[PDB]
């Protein structure tokens, strides 16, 4: 298909270009090449079309170039928002077959580090009665998405019996993550207190809760 | 402009029909394109269909087990992928180009999550996450437990409470079932004088669970 660098980096105000290089039966066979911006969990937004034209409303900081069998997207005046996956698209001369690039993960450097904001909930009464006990640890808006969770029982690593998620690029570029510790409505009562250790970089926040 | 049908599970050999309803307003009659994206992977073009001629196009990779049809009578296009294999698990989109201001632009649907699994559709169990103590400001929410497949849609006060809500990404349990939570930040002083309710929708099972939250 079309190959583009897996990732790129850049500091605010700076500007980089993402290359999309294909063959002579596609990119090199016409001016039907476009660029899409895809922010986490959202649908792709058309940024450049027909090689260099921008859709109405797209920041002219985005420009598209094309030459030979490769296309180039250049982002200038780099802003934090610009951070997302970028895809290039090609249409054969007949407009009867299109193909996308592998996508390139752009990441804006020099972004302020934030510590996780943790919150731990104890098994609801209702659930307990339903013979189940579930601890819920919601980790919020931190940066980078480099966090590690560890659960304890009274003070001892209740490793295994948990289930954590993967950092998810929130709206405000920071990350979030859940973590659920499932256990018996007996093992919860028959134990002092359970806790959710959330270590991340230097900071290590931990919230404990008890029956 | 483009509204797609809902999420479904389909056994590893079955078929699935995704519907795309062009309900916009337009003087542009371009094709309805179908692009899918498996979790974490990139975009993949499947094919399209020019409504007029009725002529449909298919990327070779899908030729043989995919059929794109348009029912002009309802301005709704359809994409049917068959011989469903596990790698077909993905979000399916429909898109269409159009002229906005002498400049091109292309609208994308919201996509639909087709889960290829030999597992049965299970409705969620909604538990209240009462506030107070470990919550000036207090946090309360709902724990949507053991459901399948994705996704689940958490809302507060039928939609009124659209401020300070935080529905997290689901977590996959060892059991293969899904679990997710949705918290809200609210004024501790408003607690006793405000009714909080999370309306959880799991279309895959046509279930909506309205759970009220509160303390002692
Ligand atoms: C209208 C225009 C360019 C249009 C380009 C197209 N293109 C070219 C796309 S691109 O050049 O690669 O961005 C199309 C491709 C496919 C389809 S279809 O599958 O829906 O039938 C339709 C189109 C368009 C919308 C005809 C430029 C106007 C300049 C003034």
SSE inventory with pairings:
The complex is a heterodimer of chains A (211) and B (216).
Chain A: E1 7-10, E2 16-21, E3 33-38, E4 45-48, E5 62-67, E6 70-75, E7 85-91, E8 98-100, E9 104-108, E10 120-121, H1 125-129, E11 133-137, E12 139-142, E13 148-153, E14 156-157, E15 175-177, E16 180-183, E17 194-200, E18 203-209
Parallel strand pairs in A: 1-9
Antiparallel strand pairs in A: 2-6, 3-4, 3-7, 5-6, 7-8, 7-9, 10-11, 11-16, 12-15, 13-14, 13-17, 17-18
Chain B: E1 2-4, E2 8-10, E3 16-22, E4 32-37, E5 44-49, E6 56-58, E7 66-71, E8 76-81, E9 90-99, E10 104-108, E11 112-116, E12 125-129, E13 137-147, E14 153-156, E15 165-167, E16 171-172, E17 178-187, E18 196-202, E19 207-213
Parallel strand pairs in B: 2-11
Antiparallel strand pairs in B: 1-3, 3-8, 4-5, 4-9, 5-6, 7-8, 9-10, 9-11, 12-13, 13-17, 14-18, 15-17, 16-17, 18-19
The structure holds the ligand CC(/C=C/C=C1/N(CCS(=O)(=O)O)c2ccc(S(=O)(=O)O)cc2C1(C)C)=C\C=C\C1=[N+](CCS(=O)(=O)O)c2ccc(S(=O)(=O)O)cc2C1(C)C.
The ligand CC(/C=C/C=C1/N(CCS(=O)(=O)O)c2ccc(S(=O)(=O)O)cc2C1(C)C)=C\C=C\C1=[N+](CCS(=O)(=O)O)c2ccc(S(=O)(=O)O)cc2C1(C)C sits between chains B (30-31, 33, 48, 50, 97, 99, 102, 104) and A (32-34, 49-50, 89, 91, 95).
Helical coverage of chain A, percent range: under 10%
The total number of structural domains of chain B is 2
Would you give the CATH topology of the largest domain in chain A?
Immunoglobulin-like
CATH A-level architecture of the largest domain in chain B: Sandwich
Terminal Cα span of chain B: 46 Å
Gap from first CA to last CA of chain A: 57 Å
Q: Would you tell me which CATH topology of the largest domain in chain B applies?
A: Immunoglobulin-like
Strand proportion of chain A, as a percent range, falls in 35-45%
Biggest sheet of chain A: strands, sense, closure?
A: 6 strands, mixed
Radius of gyration of chain B from CA coordinates:
21 Å
Percent of residues in helices of chain B comes to under 10%
The CATH fourth-level homologous superfamily of the largest domain in chain A: Immunoglobulins
Order of helices and strands of chain B: EEEEEEEEEEEEEEEEEEE
PDB class: immune system
Keywords: CDR, TSC, FAB, hucal, fluorescent DYE, immunoglobulin domain, antibody fragment, diagnostic imaging, immune system
Assembly: dimeric
Entry title: Fab fragment in complex with small molecule hapten, crystal form-1
């Amino acid at each position: 298909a079309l190959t583009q660098p897996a990732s790129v980096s850049g500091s605010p105000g700076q500007s980089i270009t993402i290359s999309c290089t294909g063959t002579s039966s596609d990119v090199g066979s016409n001016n039907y090449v476009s660029w899409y911006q895809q922010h986490p969990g959202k649908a792709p937004k058309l940024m450049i079309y027909g090689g260099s034209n921008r859709p109405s409303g797209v920041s002219n900081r985005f420009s598209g170039s094309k030459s030979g069998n490769t296309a180039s997207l250049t982002i200038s005046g780099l802003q934090a928002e610009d951070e997302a996956d970028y895809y290039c698209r090609s249409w054969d001369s007949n407009l009867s077959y299109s193909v996308f690039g592998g996508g390139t993960k752009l990441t804006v450097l020099g972004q302020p580090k934030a510590a996780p904001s943790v919150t731990l909930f104890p098994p609801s009464s209702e659930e307990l009665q339903a013979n189940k006990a579930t601890l819920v640890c919601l980790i919020s808006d931190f940066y980078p998405g480099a966090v590690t969770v560890a659960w304890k029982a009274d003070s001892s690593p209740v490793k295994a019996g948990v289930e954590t998620t993967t950092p998810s690029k929130q709206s405000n570029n920071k990350y979030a993550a859940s973590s659920y510790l499932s256990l018996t409505p007996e093992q919860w009562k028959s134990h002092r207190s359970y806790s959710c250790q959330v270590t991340h970089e230097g900071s290590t926040v931990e919230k404990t809760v008890a029956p | 402009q483009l509204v797609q049908s809902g999420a479904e599970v389909k056994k590893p050999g079955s078929s699935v029909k995704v519907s795309c309803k062009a309900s916009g307003g337009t003087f542009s009659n371009y094709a309805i394109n179908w692009v899918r994206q498996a979790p974490g992977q990139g975009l993949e073009w499947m094919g399209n269909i020019e409504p007029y001629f009725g002529t449909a196009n298919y990327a070779q990779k899908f030729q043989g087990r995919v059929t794109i049809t348009a029912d002009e009578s309802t301005s709704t296009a359809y994409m049917e992928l068959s011989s469903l294999r596990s790698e077909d698990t993905a979000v399916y989109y429909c898109a269409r180009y159009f002229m906005s201001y002498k400049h091109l632009s292309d609208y994308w649907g919201q996509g639909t999550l087709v889960t290829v699994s030999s597992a049965s559709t299970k409705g969620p169990s909604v538990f209240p996450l009462a506030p107070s103590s470990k919550s000036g400001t207090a946090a309360l929410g709902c724990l949507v437990k053991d459901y399948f497949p994705e996704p689940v849609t958490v809302s507060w006060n039928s939609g009124a409470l659209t401020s300070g809500v935080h529905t997290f990404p689901a977590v996959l349990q060892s059991s293969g079932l899904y679990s997710l939570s949705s918290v809200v930040t609210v004024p501790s002083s408003s607690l006793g004088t405000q009714t909080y309710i999370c309306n959880v929708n799991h279309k895959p099972s046509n279930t909506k669970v309205d759970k009220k939250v509160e303390p002692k």
